[PDB]
Write a structure and sequence with these properties.
The structure holds 2 chains of a larger assembly. The first copy, chain A, has 174 residues and is α+β, with helices and mostly antiparallel strands. Helix content of chain A is 22%, strand content 31%. The PDB classes it as rna binding protein/dna.
Chain lengths: 174, 174
């Protein structure tokens, strides 16, 4: 962005031969029936389809209704489970999904600690807190994943788990 | 094409000496009389007659008007009851024989990937997925054969095949 792409969503695995009007009608009906609309009228203003590569982009009338519609990921439309995602060019603001990692062995270096974390996916930020005078690790760190959906996967996979004779704490830093 | 067969119908038991222009007028008047058209104008674009074997094909302007015209089975024309059926290669569930091709060496271009596929028969659709930023192959593709009976012979011939450094995955895309 930083503020771009806030009112559009990517839709994959669309049904073969479906029209832009039919897709618009389906999504507007689901928004109403699902209770995700925040005002009278239709949230989806327009749909654009790429036939050759079988995907669509929805254009919404507001920022908050776009976010709500991410909940339809996997909905079945004419036999097809839809893939609903943010636009490539969409990015949350810096530090929005920062993680605190505590209970790490203090003899492990930066690259050795990153190896545990990057097993869930690539990182866009990382720092292991060290004593500045001696350069020695204080046993806690902070990180942020490139894909924000990985954040909850890392928490579920690492929080409360055994690492040596310590139990790790992995949680959102704020 | 796939939906090309979705816009035509087979007509049997045609009277001797009938002309294509006479058939065309008849079906257009029947469509307008039954309130079965979805726009102004004439739903039938063209008619082809085989005189020796007493059958015709009609071509329509839309998928939904074609479906509506199936109701004319048994209709009387010049004293005779016409037989109205779908074409033999009509696909009720479109996109059912679309294939996904994964495990492609990432230096291969469109023409090279097609050459692999066209050993089994001619294609009606093809695309190689690339990164829009660099124009570089993501290593997977999609296709449809002109004859859908070739689909399973292609899967059997290609799926699991060693292609240089990689192993191909060929399956129905869903």
């Amino acid at each position: 962005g930083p503020l771009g792409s806030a009112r559009r969503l990517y839709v994959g695995n669309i049904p073969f031969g479906i029209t832009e009007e039919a897709m618009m009608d389906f999504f507007n009906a689901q928004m109403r029936l699902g209770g995700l609309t925040q005002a009278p009228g239709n949230p989806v203003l327009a749909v654009q389809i790429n036939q050759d590569k079988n995907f669509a982009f929805l254009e919404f009338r507001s920022v908050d209704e776009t976010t709500q519609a991410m909940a339809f990921d996997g909905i079945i439309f004419q036999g097809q489970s839809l893939k609903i995602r943010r636009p490539h060019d969409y990015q949350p603001l810096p530090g929005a999904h920062k993680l605190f990692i505590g209970g790490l062995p203090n003899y492990l270096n930066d690259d050795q600690v990153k190896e545990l974390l990057t097993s869930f996916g690539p990182l866009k930020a990382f720092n292991l807190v060290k004593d500045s005078a001696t350069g020695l690790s204080k046993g806690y760190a902070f990180c942020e994943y490139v894909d924000i959906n990985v954040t909850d996967q890392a928490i579920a996979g690492l929080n409360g788990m055994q690492l040596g004779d310590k139990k790790l704490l992995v949680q959102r830093a704020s």
